[PDB]
Amino acid sequence: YPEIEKFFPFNPLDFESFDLPEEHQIAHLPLSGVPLMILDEERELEKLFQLGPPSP
Amino acid sequence: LSPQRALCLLELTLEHCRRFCWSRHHDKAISAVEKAHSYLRTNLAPSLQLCQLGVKLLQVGPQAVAKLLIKASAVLSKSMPPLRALYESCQFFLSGLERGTKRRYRLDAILSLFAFLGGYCSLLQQLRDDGVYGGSSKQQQSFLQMYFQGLHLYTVVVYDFAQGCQIVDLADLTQLVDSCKSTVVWMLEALEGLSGQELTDHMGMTASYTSNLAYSFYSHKLYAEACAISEPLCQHLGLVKPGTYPEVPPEKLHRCFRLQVESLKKLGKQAQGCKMVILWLAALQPCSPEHMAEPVTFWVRVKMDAARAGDKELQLKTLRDSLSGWDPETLALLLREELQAYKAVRADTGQERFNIICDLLELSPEETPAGAWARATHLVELAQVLCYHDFTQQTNCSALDAIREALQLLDSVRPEAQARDQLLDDKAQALLWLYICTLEAKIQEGIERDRRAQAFLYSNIAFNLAADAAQSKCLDQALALWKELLTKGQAPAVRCLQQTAASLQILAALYQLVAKPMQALEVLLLLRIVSERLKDHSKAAGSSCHITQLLLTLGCPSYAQLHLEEAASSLKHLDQTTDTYLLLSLTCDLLRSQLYWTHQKVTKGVSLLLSVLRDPALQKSSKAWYLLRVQVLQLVAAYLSLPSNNLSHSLWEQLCAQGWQTPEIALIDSHKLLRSIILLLMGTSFLDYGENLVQKWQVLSEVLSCSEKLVCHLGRLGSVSEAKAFCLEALKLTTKLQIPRQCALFLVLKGELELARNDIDLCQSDLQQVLFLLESCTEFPTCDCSLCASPVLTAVCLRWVLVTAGVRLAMGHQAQGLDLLQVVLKGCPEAAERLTQALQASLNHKTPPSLVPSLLDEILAQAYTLLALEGLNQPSNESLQKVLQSGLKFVAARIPHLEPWRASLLLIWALTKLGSTLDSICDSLSVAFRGISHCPPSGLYAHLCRFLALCLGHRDPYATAFLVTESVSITCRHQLLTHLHRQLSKAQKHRDVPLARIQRLFSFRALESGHFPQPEKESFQERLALIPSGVTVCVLALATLQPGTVGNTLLLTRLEKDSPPVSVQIPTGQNKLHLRSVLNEFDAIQKAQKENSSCTDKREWWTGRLALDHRMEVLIASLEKSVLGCWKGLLLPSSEEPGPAQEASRLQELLQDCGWKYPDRTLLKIMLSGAGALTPQDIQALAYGLCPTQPERAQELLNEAVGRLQGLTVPSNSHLVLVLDKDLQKLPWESMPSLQALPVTRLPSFRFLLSYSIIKEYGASPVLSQGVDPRSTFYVLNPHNNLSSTEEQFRANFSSEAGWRGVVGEVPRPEQVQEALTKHDLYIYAGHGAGARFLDGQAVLRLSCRAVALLFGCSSAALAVHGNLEGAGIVLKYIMAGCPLFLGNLWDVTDRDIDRYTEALLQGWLGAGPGAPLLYYVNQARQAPRLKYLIGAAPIAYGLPVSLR
């Protein structure tokens, strides 16, 4: 009368961990910060320094 | 002449000289000179001499001329009575000089002129000083005009000389330096004690003169003296604080100051420049809130330049500090201007803006009703500066507190009529930033939750919180405020319209992220309105590009063309050769490529797209370029999803040569690039810091859109693991940002992905979650509140009504599922029509051609598919030919797009016509096959290949074999292509020919141009030519006549090297035993095993084990007898010796006489190679099948042939690779009686054998070429410490072995198990399953696999088949990573019996000696364990035969 052996069933699908490769990971990053508001020079003074001849 | 006569003579002589000048004569002047010579005797004589000298100088018009000028000045100096006469004389001399502007003047001539001018000036000033000159208002004015007239002439000469002054003549300019600065001194003194009007007009020319005088040096890099020239005026003008010069043009005063400030700032001296800006504003003290702007810009320019030089102390010198005594309102306006100018720079000025806002809060008195306004405006600016980098060392006010205080102050303000526009502006801006900083609060709250570590339905219902109504309402009101501001058509009259433009950009980005696309459309229309009002065509072009991209994301491509044309029209007005123009031009080209794609003019679109893809401007490092590459990659994926008949062949080659071979690869690269952008935002020298704010909410919206594309695509392909991975990533992001609509979308997607894997519980959980979220979103036919108005919500609702019908049909309700599908059938048309009307009203056009075909078309196509699949099970000959015809027509109007659904509908039509008609089925299915061959749906591709290889068979041998070959392991093929692309990417980034070769081997569109079966057949013939020697490939496949069933007819296709493909059809549908029954019995055995292993009575336990083993051996015997029957020598080797071939020829002819259609030789050559073991009943069935008309003499002839071929030998060196379907892989074919002595392994697809060969050609696979070493082995013995019975014995024998470095009892670190697979030849795992916990499929796929994997666990090499999806398991990831051989169990086994098996295998193989076949010892060790069929038939091998070295 042989004793009962063990029996440890395993589903082959329980191996998958739905983890992306670290180049596709977005939600674990600290999406904190609002990086200012830059309103570029409406007037480019660069071309405001020329008078040429002493016109009357 | 008497004194009076002499005075009259001077007047007459001057008149004579003036008369000579009156006609510009010289001979007459000579006559007057003779008259003067006659008068020569006086004070007027020197004066007359000067006039004569002037005439001589006029005649000269060089060195002598210079000497004459000096001589004139010298005599004039002595004269200056005589000085009074010298004036009239100097006027004549100056008249000659006026006509002597030869421009060819040298500093010496200018110095001589300066001498004469200075002498005249001294005499003129003395004459003007004389009370008489001042006494006569006009007379003083006349002398004053004369002085200024002379100075105007002087600077003209100076500028003429400065123009003549070149790089070499700079020394000459430095010579004129003296007179220039002295000139300024004289000019200022001339303005002393002057009448207001006279002083102001003279001030204008005075400043103008020095501006021209100073500019010359500045225009030649000589600031020091340029500053010395303007220093006196700037100081005098600045010191006189009283505004005594209100009229003097601010435009002039500006120039002089501007010049000195630049001269100092270009020479450092930032401190002096700051004081000069203070003096500048001091001069413009009582000016308008307009002229003060330029000084303030120069302030910020001097301040920012100071920072570059480390002049941090300039920041310490602030305006409020510098301009101590200034009217509050004026200082508040000046600090507003400084705030705006700081907003204009690009170099981390957050702290400076914070200082300005703090001082503006301190200066604005909250008491005044006109101070509450300034309080609120500075508070929204403080909110802006705090949602960026919150300052905990100052203020002690939170950002969400500042903004709410501002909103209350604004609600307390009442305007009149001129400021209502400013009120609407600031209120809308406050509401926008209220939303922004509530979202930042949510972000940091989630960050704190996730940081709380110490030492998801609930999460969804918690994050919902019914807070959507609070936040979205504020943006919905900011939009209305901006709209009432900008829609009137009149001028806006706001502070900075640029700020309105930037806020509208942020609002469009935010709406895109909250998934409200129509609101973003309206916001972009208003941004285009404002952009024309501001004459900024960059922004108009960008707004039109965005409107076009958003209209193409929706259905309507007609309205996108108008706005693309508008974008081009705005592009005309740009500089070109500038990054803005390059970017907007590439964007418009991309939009036109997409318009061609949707307009079915695909070849011009591909030409455009390849022009875009080959531009070196698309690769320059900047974030807008990365967004453009993202859109490029999504368009490339949209072009890779078209059938090959739409495009030419070289077009496909050059399109795939860019680096992206499938839409999945393109979309994952899009996702990767979208992540790399965020690493740049949420961190440079701030060069690209211009659009970071809008980009931060554009990148998140694009991430969610890319994830929707990458999830809806990978799930339709059947790859549900990666699809769920991306779906979970996006759900995590959306719960982080707390966006209900996007998370509802992604929950419905995850529900469909779980329904694909037959998980009704998880799908119903997700469905209830989205029902909760949709009840939250709605504000609680033609209008269903917020749901109907929004397209995204109607889409998510119809996807709910689709996945719910799918679940309702999976559990088996039918009527309810059909009613839900018919609801989805009436839902998409009305949804598209209401979106059409909404888009027309929003853009304000007339009659949009055709309805909007967005994702509603795809969901209606899937509804048609699922409603056609249910007419098969209820073939009542009614609404089946009327639901499939309508679906076919629908899907046939949009030809290049809805292609998988037309293939599904064609397959269903073929299955309905199945029960000439065979040719009709074949052509229909060939249409479908070419419809999905480029990127197959894995589940449809199998049904389509096997139905097409069943209709078309023996009438076309090679084509039938090719279809059977492609119907296996499609998902593994997709995954291998993706893995190879990732390998190429990482290998290029780290620093490959075999990689590209394998990619070509697995590619879906590496075909030539052809009709229906020809180019496919040619590629298949090449692949057949690639088979190695000594290997037989049997592809067993179940031909399924319904999608979702099992099937009975076994398609067996044998593949050899230099032999035609021999295929056979084994219809096991009447053979009593069936094959469905075999699979049912196997499932029953595996269920009974686990239900029995719970009993504790050892006797009943062993009885059940024995009964299951007997059942298992009966099943194995039945496979060979009934399942294969006579057609079972197709798996046996081929006789190298002649004999079968000659008999094959003779029998071919003679049986062809007997009525054998499709006579073939290789079939009989392989069926007679095993004649030694051929039984009379096999010969009976074979004969009665081959030759039905005259069978008896066919048997007799076959009996004679086998009797003549009685003695033979199968080849010693040979091998059989079994390619099984997803349903037949679980049966233990390797343990059938016939295949017990024969080496037999498995592979996923036939292409994997060729891949192993290709890798063997180059290396990287030492074991499959050299041999396994007895040493060099890593073992994992009992890592979970459950099984000690094994642990003890296996510990003894393993430790006894030399060179074996492993673990025992403990779970191995992932690093050492990585090194175990990589650096070793053998990986003996004695434990639970297949590693899994410490080594999962992704970790090995990320790895190279050198070692043989002897994984001795329960279901180690089993593939889990869930639903209509193909098998998944870690063995696939092992052999996709290059594992030569992978041994593992197939079903659950027990402990000590599997230990006995493992001990036998390891004692037989290891220790046999060098060159010991492993597959020989897996069958030799299969007779050691007690239950020889229940735990002996379980071990299975994947790969190629290996041997010990």
UniProtKB/Swiss-Prot annotation, chain A:
Cellular localization per UniProt: Cytoplasm; Nucleus
Residues the record lists as Phosphoserine modifications: 55
Disulfide bonds: none
Tissue: Expressed at low level in most tissues, except in adult testis, where it is highly expressed. Overexpressed in many patients suffering from pituitary adenomas, primary epithelial neoplasias, and esophageal cancer.
Domain of life: Eukaryota
Modification(s) after translation: Phosphorylated at Ser-55 by CDK1 during mitosis. Phosphorylated in vitro by ds-DNA kinase.
Domain writeup: The N-terminal destruction box (D-box) acts as a recognition signal for degradation via the ubiquitin-proteasome pathway.
Entry function: Regulatory protein, which plays a central role in chromosome stability, in the p53/TP53 pathway, and DNA repair. Probably acts by blocking the action of key proteins. During the mitosis, it blocks Separase/ESPL1 function, preventing the proteolysis of the cohesin complex and the subsequent segregation of the chromosomes. At the onset of anaphase, it is ubiquitinated, conducting to its destruction and to the liberation of ESPL1. Its function is however not limited to a blocking activity, since it is required to activate ESPL1.
Family: Belongs to the securin family.
UniProt subunit comment: Interacts with RPS10 and DNAJA1. Interacts with the caspase-like ESPL1, and prevents its protease activity probably by covering its active site. Interacts with TP53 and blocks its activity probably by blocking its binding to DNA. Interacts with the Ku 70 kDa subunit of ds-DNA kinase. Interacts with PTTG1IP.
Stated name of the protein: Securin
Organism: Homo sapiens (Human)
Origin organism lineage: Eukaryota, Metazoa, Chordata, Craniata, Vertebrata
Portion of the full-length sequence here: 111 to 166 of 202
From Swiss-Prot, chain B:
InterPro entries hit by this protein: Peptidase_C50, SEPARIN_core_dom
Pfam families membership: Peptidase_C50 (PF03568)
Biological process per Gene Ontology, one example term: positive regulation of mitotic metaphase/anaphase transition
Molecular-function annotations in GO: catalytic activity; cysteine-type endopeptidase activity; cysteine-type peptidase activity
Compartments, record wording: Cytoplasm; Nucleus
Ranges of residues in domain Peptidase C50: 1270-1365
Regulation: Regulated by at least two independent mechanisms. First, it is inactivated via its interaction with securin/PTTG1, which probably covers its active site. The association with PTTG1 is not only inhibitory, since PTTG1 is also required for activating it, the enzyme being inactive in cells in which PTTG1 is absent. PTTG1 degradation at anaphase, liberates it and triggers RAD21 cleavage. The complete phosphorylation during mitosis, is removed when cells undergo anaphase.
Reactions the enzyme catalyzes: All bonds known to be hydrolyzed by this endopeptidase have arginine in P1 and an acidic residue in P4. P6 is often occupied by an acidic residue or by a hydroxy-amino-acid residue, the phosphorylation of which enhances cleavage
Alphabetic keyword roster: Autocatalytic cleavage, Chromosome partition, Cytoplasm, Hydrolase, Nucleus, Phosphoprotein, Protease, Thiol protease
Modified how: Autocleaves. This function, which is not essential for its protease activity, is unknown. Phosphorylated by CDK1. There are 8 Ser/Thr phosphorylation sites.
GO annotations of cellular component type: centrosome; cytoplasm; cytosol; mitotic spindle; nucleus
The protein's Enzyme Commission number: 3.4.22.49
Active site residues of this protein: 1354
Superkingdom assignment: Eukaryota
Complex and partners: Interacts with PTTG1. Interacts with RAD21.
Role summary: Caspase-like protease, which plays a central role in the chromosome segregation by cleaving the SCC1/RAD21 subunit of the cohesin complex at the onset of anaphase. During most of the cell cycle, it is inactivated by different mechanisms.
Protein name, entry field: Separin
Species whose genome carries this gene: Homo sapiens (Human)
